[PDB]
Design a protein around this ligand. Structure first.
Ligand SMILES: CCCCCCCCCCCCCCCCCC(=O)OC[C@H](COP(=O)([O-])OCC(O)COP(=O)([O-])OC[C@@H](COC(=O)CCCCCCCCCCCCCCCCC)OC(=O)CCCCCCCCCCCCCCCCC)OC(=O)CCCCCCCCCCCCCCCCC
Ligand SMILES: CCCCCCCCCCCCCCCCCC(=O)OC[C@H](COP(=O)([O-])OCC(O)COP(=O)([O-])OC[C@@H](COC(=O)CCCCCCCCCCCCCCCCC)OC(=O)CCCCCCCCCCCCCCCCC)OC(=O)CCCCCCCCCCCCCCCCC
Ligand SMILES: CCCCCCCCCCCCCC(=O)SCCNC(=O)CCNC(=O)[C@@H](O)C(C)(C)COP(=O)(O)O
Ligand code: SF4
Ligand code: SF4
Ligand code: SF4
Ligand SMILES: [Zn+2]
Lengths: 117, 208, 114, 42, 186, 90, 182, 90, 78
């Protein structure tokens, strides 16, 4: 039983949301597998993608999956998975797990500016 | 009980503190300092090289969908070495929260345009450029959005005068609206509203 | 006395001078369209003389980021001049019209109080 | 005395959309048009 | 009753959520409303019913619309019942004036009073915000009831001290009645 | 002749005949208030009191000036600095 | 000022009449030109068409004389969008530096006679942005203004009072008498 | 009484409107009185004479500088974290 | 913010996203604001209007013309 409309303009109802979600989570895992293990983003992304893949594997119904995940509808889950895949393929280029490229200068981040010493 | 004192929201404090430590852990390259201000607002103080990779991250992560960008604000603090600061305020509709991402920028040093991340930065980054001279590189078209077409200078810097440099009047010899040096009929009366006694002892040593 | 910064629109002074020459070339090509499409009293030769005067006013600068800032603002004024967004009064703001020429000698400034 | 609501409160302020009364029906309108033009032809 | 395309939650109301009806009675009703201009007939009838309504035109200037005792109009300088001017030149009104219209210059008078030598309000600069009457410790400056003071000439709206004192002399009854009927709110 | 130009105000100001600024009054009236405060506060009599310190309110409570206390030990007339009313002790 | 006349004094005063000139002209040609100017000013004050020039908040009150309570249409006053068909321009809002050649061009394309009403403290004198970098210090430096309506958002009785003052100015216009004395 | 048409025009207007018409203009008997007795404003929580100190209820002086969240864990240590509760906007 | 959690109302949500859905959402906002107005007139407490910190809010005119601290705070805050 598929829904008539998702309630949002411009979003189409997915015919196969389970396979799309599983393929997107597998692509996110294959993207973050190239990252070093000491990076925190890889560990947190692997944890959330593993628990959401367990959620889409335990529940074969659409409405039970949207109730179990709890973050919007399943089309929004597909949108979030594509967004995270884009983010991870940008993380493999940007490499943000290293040190700071520019430290804060002196008297930069203190707000009251003209106080002496 | 104190009914004239605003009570802070603890569920907007603990979640924002855990998320601030989370975003400090996930991006150690760009994030220098996260701080939870009075009023339960979270500030992230990034490097100027990390404007795009931080605002992309908060756009597209599962634990942070800061997909709405409400306003990009420029503050001119001429005391500092990098005088301008640029504040991106982001709203997360999925997790019902707000974040502020602050960076420091000089007028000659360019900044990364967030137009590829959020399309509202197509116009907001123009406005700071019209008012501070903060050049945003890799912008679609960086034009003059609010001031006059023949305006020379950026008005919202603190080194710019309040009444401007020039005025406009109609010349019926040239049959056009001409530009004249400024002469006010009554000058702006600068009031010295400075407090000689300090009133906040908690902000006395907040600078280091 | 030397710092490492992020370049804006140039990486060397010869490249910045080349892009300033691009700006001058495009302004010189856009002069007779400005004289044709605006109802201004200034002619083509006066517009070219004003363009040369505004370039030799900024002849003195040396810094790469400052000259790239000048090139960027000049290209923005040019883009405001190709597409007609400026008016006839905005074009004639380069020539200081409706302004009395202030004297340079000390005697006339002493009589006038300046 | 301060500016306060009366005891028992105010009445229920109407906010819903009530439609105007529609006397006509589409079958009735089509049939009356057919009958009127059939008399008019004669 | 058409079905819902999107299930309406408890705290929300949905517009244009009804399904388009497909039974023949509703199709014939919509067809007759399209062909014979039934909804346009209802709009014409609703329009024609407003000709018979009462006009709300209040016939200016024989009949003037409602005002309030708090109304902000022409600024004016009041006086004591003994006759001395109320304004002690204490300059909180100029300090609080956001457009900085008020200019006060004060000297000691012959009997030793503090009262002004110059009190000018630029009414072309004044924004009629009423901060001066709230910031007045005595009841000297006040928002008068007058708003029919349109001028032919730009300089005539530059109000002097004598013009404000003449406004206080002219409008004293209504200003005093408004201040008597309004002081316990402030 | 017009008598509204050379008439002095209560601030002691008048445009003299050699001034260029009297050309603004050739088509408009010069507004001079005829109700001076000095004569209107000298017209009222002083108030005689027996107690050493008195209070001046200037009229009604919320509609008058802020309350001040005047000490009447010194002989003479003591003037309130707010309203100008004079008190005296017998 | 003048004291408004007491009814004992005012009962001895005769009626003013419609004509500000009076019917006591000496020459028959001067009287005929006076009545022709009276008819011309009656036709001009009987219908002034202001222009839809709403710059800022003041214009929200400008529509409030279009509104059914105040009803500008029974005063000859009806809005026209084109500047050629309009008599009056009502500067209702904040004239800025980018707004100056647009207002001057719109006023210059309007045909003469041209009466201008400055609505609000931003229109005359600059007002609350008088010390701003990009606000013209009143519209009197650009467009010549006949009526100046004082209030920051003028009440709509005060804007219509400015309209009636403009109608009294139009009724006081002397053109043919000046032509006879030119 | 109210300024209104005769009932024939009333029923014509009510038939053309499609609903029972109520008057869109205010009247004197259907509005509040313009003249009215003087009110009294009730006092708040801090108008008590005793046990009111400003420092116990000082709103401006309880504001602290913002806490460095990286250093807060370091000086306090000597279900993924979300910035708020999940709202389903679908 | 400011007793919007003590009032109850519905939120108009469109579907198509065109001008007609936004117009219907605006008129439905005008309809729901009537019941928020009804709740606000139904419950209104009797109390003060300003906060009683006199260093952030101006005092009453009777306290300004009677007491000393209210006159000092009126002077300073104005
Ligand atoms: C070259 C020759 C001149 C050319 C230019 C002429 C300009 C005329 C307009 C003008 O501005 O005149 C001002 C000029 C100055 O007037 P005023 O002396 O200052 O004012 C007169 C009173 O003091 C103040 O006026 P008032 O209060 O006495 O009222 C004026 C008028 C009442 O006012 C009017 O009649 C105004 C017009 C209303 C017309 C309504 C119907 C329109 C239909 C259109 C189709 O009163 C009367 O007409 C008398 C009472 C009539 C009672 C009728 C009862 C019927 C039942 O008027 C005159 O000089 C009046 C005499 C000349 C006008 C024409 C007279 C002959 C033709 C009459 C109509 C025949 C048909
Ligand atoms: C069989 C046929 C039966 C009648 C069919 C038509 C019925 C509808 C109708 O005309 O209603 C108007 C009127 C009823 O008044 P309404 O519109 O219900 O309410 C008006 C308000 O009460 C007005 O408020 P108010 O309470 O102040 O009323 C006092 C005064 C208010 O007065 C004013 O506002 C000033 C009027 C100044 C008039 C100056 C020029 C007079 C020239 C003569 O009202 C009038 O002067 C009413 C004048 C009505 C004229 C009606 C002309 C109808 C012509 C045929 C139409 C079909 O009915 C009639 O006058 C019936 C007689 C018509 C003329 C018969 C001649 C023989
Ligand atoms: C109206 C009609 C036109 C009126 C005049 C409009 C002038 C518009 C341009 C004014 C604003 C500008 O872009 S001026 C700034 C451009 N930059 C400079 O002039 C820097 C000069 N420095 C240089 O090294 C060169 O560009 C030279 C010296 C111009 C080129 O080098 P050559 O090898 O001598
Ligand atoms: S606040 Fe009142 S008494 Fe004080 S200077 Fe202004 S008008 Fe005069
Ligand atoms: S009402 Fe406002 S703008 Fe006008 S004089 Fe008073 S404080 Fe100034
Ligand atoms: S005069 Fe006042 S109301 Fe009018 S545009 Fe300016 S601020 Fe707005
Ligand atoms: Zn006193």
């Amino acid at each position: 039983i598929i829904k008539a409309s998702t309630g949002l303009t411009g979003l189409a109802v997915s015919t196969n949301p389970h396979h799309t979600l599983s393929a997107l989570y597998g692509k996110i895992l294959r993207a973050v597998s190239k990252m070093p293990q000491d990076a925190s983003y890889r560990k947190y992304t692997e944890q959330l993608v593993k628990q959401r893949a367990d959620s889409v594997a335990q529940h074969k119904d659409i409405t039970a999956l949207e109730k179990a995940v709890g973050c919007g509808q399943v089309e929004e889950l597909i949108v979030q998975a594509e967004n995270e895949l884009i983010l991870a393929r940008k993380m493999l280029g940007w490499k943000p797990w290293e040190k700071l490229v520019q430290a804060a200068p002196a008297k930069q981040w203190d707000w009251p500016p003209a106080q002496i010493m | 009980d104190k009914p004239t004192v605003r009570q802070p929201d603890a569920v907007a404090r603990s979640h924002l503190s855990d998320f601030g430590r989370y975003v400090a852990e996930c991006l150690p390259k760009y994030v220098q300092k996260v701080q939870l201000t009075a009023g339960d607002e979270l500030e992230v103080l990034i490097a100027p090289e990390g404007v795009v990779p931080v605002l992309q991250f908060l756009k597209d992560h599962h634990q942070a969908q800061f997909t709405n960008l409400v306003d990009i604000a420029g503050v001119d603090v001429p005391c500092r070495k990098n005088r301008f600061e640029v504040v991106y305020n982001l709203l997360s509709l999925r997790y019902n929260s707000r974040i502020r991402v602050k960076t420091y920028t000089d007028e000659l040093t360019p900044l990364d345009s967030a137009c590829e991340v959020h399309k509202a930065a197509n116009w907001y980054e123009r406005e700071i450029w019209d008012m501070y001279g903060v050049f945003f590189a890799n912008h679609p078209d960086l034009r003059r959005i609010l001031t006059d077409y023949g305006f020379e200078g950026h008005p919202q810097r603190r080194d710019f005068p309040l009444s401007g440099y020039v005025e406009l009047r109609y010349d019926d010899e040239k049959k056009r609206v001409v530009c004249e040096p400024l002469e006010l009929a009554q000058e702006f009366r600068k009031f010295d509203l400075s407090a000689p006694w300090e009133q906040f002892p908690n902000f006395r040593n907040a600078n280091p | 006395a030397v710092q490492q910064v992020r370049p804006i629109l140039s990486v060397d002074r010869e490249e910045a001078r080349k892009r300033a020459l691009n700006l001058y070339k495009a302004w010189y090509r856009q002069i007779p369209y400005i004289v044709m499409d605006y109802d201004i009293p200034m002619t083509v030769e006066q517009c070219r003389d004003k363009l040369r005067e505004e370039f030799v006013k900024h002849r003195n600068v040396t810094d790469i980021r400052v000259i790239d800032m000048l090139v960027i603002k000049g290209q923005m004024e040019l883009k405001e001049s190709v597409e007609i967004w400026k008016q006839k009064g905005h074009i004639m703001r380069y020539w200081k019209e409706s302004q009395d020429p202030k004297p340079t000698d000390f005697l006339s400034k002493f009589i006038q109080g300046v | 005395k301060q500016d306060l609501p009366p005891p028992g409160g105010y009445k229920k302020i109407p906010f819903a959309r009530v439609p105007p009364k529609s006397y006509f029906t589409g079958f009735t309108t089509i049939g009356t048009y057919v009958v009127v033009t059939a008399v008019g032809l004669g | 009753e058409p079905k819902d395309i999107v299930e309406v939650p408890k705290g929300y109301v949905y517009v244009n959520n009804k399904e388009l009806s497909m039974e023949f009675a509703d199709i014939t009703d919509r067809a007759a409303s399209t062909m014979f201009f039934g909804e346009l007939l209802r709009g014409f009838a609703v329009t024609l019913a407003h000709i018979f309504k009462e006009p709300a035109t209040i016939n200016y200037p024989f009949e003037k619309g409602p005002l309030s005792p708090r109304f902000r109009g022409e600024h004016a300088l009041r006086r004591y019942p003994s006759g001395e001017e109320r304004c002690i030149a204490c300059k909180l009104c100029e300090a609080i004036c956001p457009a900085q219209a008020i200019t006060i210059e004060a000297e000691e008078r012959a009997d030793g009073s503090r009262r002004t030598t110059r009190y000018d309000i630029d009414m072309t600069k004044c924004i009629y915000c009423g901060f001066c009457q709230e910031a007045c410790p005595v009841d000297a400056i006040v928002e008068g009831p007058n708003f029919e003071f349109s001028t032919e000439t730009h300089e005539e709206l530059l109000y002097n001290k004598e013009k404000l004192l003449c406004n206080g002399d002219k409008w004293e009854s209504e200003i005093a009645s408004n201040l008597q009927a309004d002081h316990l709110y402030r | 002749c017009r008598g509204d130009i050379e008439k002095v105000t209560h601030t002691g100001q008048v445009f003299d005949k050699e001034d260029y600024r009297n050309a603004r009054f050739v088509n408009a009236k010069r507004y001079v208030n005829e109700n001076w405060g000095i004569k209107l506060i000298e017209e009222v009599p002083p108030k005689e009191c027996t107690e050493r310190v008195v209070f001046c309110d200037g009229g009604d409570g919320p509609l008058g000036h802020p309350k001040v206390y005047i000490n009447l030990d010194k002989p003479g007339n003591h003037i309130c600095g707010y309203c100008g009313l004079r008190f005296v002790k017998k | 000022q003048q004291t408004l006349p007491v009814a004992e004094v005012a009962q001895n005063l005769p009626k003013k009449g419609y004509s500000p000139f009076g019917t006591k002209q000496s020459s028959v040609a001067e009287w005929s030109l006076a009545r022709l100017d009276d008819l011309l000013n009656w036709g001009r004050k009987g219908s002034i068409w202001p222009l839809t020039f709403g710059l800022a908040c003041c214009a929200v009150e400008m529509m409030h004389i279009a509104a059914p309570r105040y009803d500008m249409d029974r005063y000859g006053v009806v809005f026209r969008a084109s500047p050629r068909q309009a008599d009056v321009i009502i500067v209702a809002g904040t004239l800025t530096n980018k707004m100056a050649p647009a207002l001057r061009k719109v006023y210059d394309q309007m045909p003469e006679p041209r009466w201008v009403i400055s609505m609000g403290s931003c229109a005359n004198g600059g007002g609350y942005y008088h010390y701003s970098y990009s606000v013209v210090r009143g519209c009197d430096r650009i467009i010549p203004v006949d009526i100046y309506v004082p209030g920051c958002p003028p009440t709509a009785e005060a804007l219509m009072y400015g309209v009636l003052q403009l109608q009294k100015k139009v009724k006081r216009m002397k053109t043919l008498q000046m032509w006879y004395r030119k | 009484l109210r300024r209104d048409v005769s009932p024939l025009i009333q029923r014509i207007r009510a038939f053309l409107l499609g609903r029972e018409h109520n008057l869109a203009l205010r009247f004197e008997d259907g509005l509040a009185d313009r003249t009215q007795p003087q009110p009294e404003i009730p006092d708040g929580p801090s108008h008590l004479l005793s046990a009111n100190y400003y420092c116990q209820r000082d709103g401006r002086r309880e504001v602290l500088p913002p806490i460095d969240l990286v250093e807060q864990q370091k000086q306090l240590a000597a279900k993924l974290p979300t910035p708020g509760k999940v709202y389903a906007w679908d | 913010y400011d007793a919007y959690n003590l009032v109850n109302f519905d939120v108009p949500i469109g579907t198509k996203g065109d001008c007609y859905d936004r117009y219907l959402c605006r008129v439905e906002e005008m309809r729901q604001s009537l019941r928020i107005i009804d709740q606000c007139l139904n419950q209104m407490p009797a109390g003060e209007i300003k906060t009683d910190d006199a260093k952030v809010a101006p005092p009453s005119r009777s306290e300004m013309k009677t007491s000393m601290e209210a006159l000092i705070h009126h002077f300073k805050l104005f």
